Amino acid sequence: LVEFLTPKNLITKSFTKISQKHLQLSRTPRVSPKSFDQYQVKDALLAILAGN
DNA sequence: CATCAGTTCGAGTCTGGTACTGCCCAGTAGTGATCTTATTTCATTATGGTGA
């Protein structure tokens, strides 16, 4: 990590083993981008705001 | 042309930075009681030599 942080040493490099190693093919995505409507949520909040 | 790579928008999820609530325990110092012990007295007990 220390060498990679320095940008000068990374210039004088000839990475070759990078293209030979690969162990990342299946990654589980997020659950879902569930819908969010501003109007309905705001109306419910104001009602509960009214809610007493 | 339709595939893949470079860009956006907004939601998912963690986490710091900031304040707050409902509830009994634990330690210490008084007394009064009852043992407990390193240490101080109350008798017998043996040793002593000599003038009547």
SS3 A15: coil
Pair A10, A3: CB distance under 8 Å: yes
Resolution (A): 3.7
Q: Is the CB of A4 under 7 A from strand B?
A: no
Q: Is the CB of A30 under 7 A from strand B?
A: yes
Q: Which long-range contacts (CB under 8 A, 24 or more apart) does A37-41 make?
A: none
Q: How far apart are CA A17 and CA A48, in angstroms?
A: 60
Technique employed here was cryo-EM
Q: Give the CA-to-C1' distance from A46 to B31 in angstroms.
A: 68
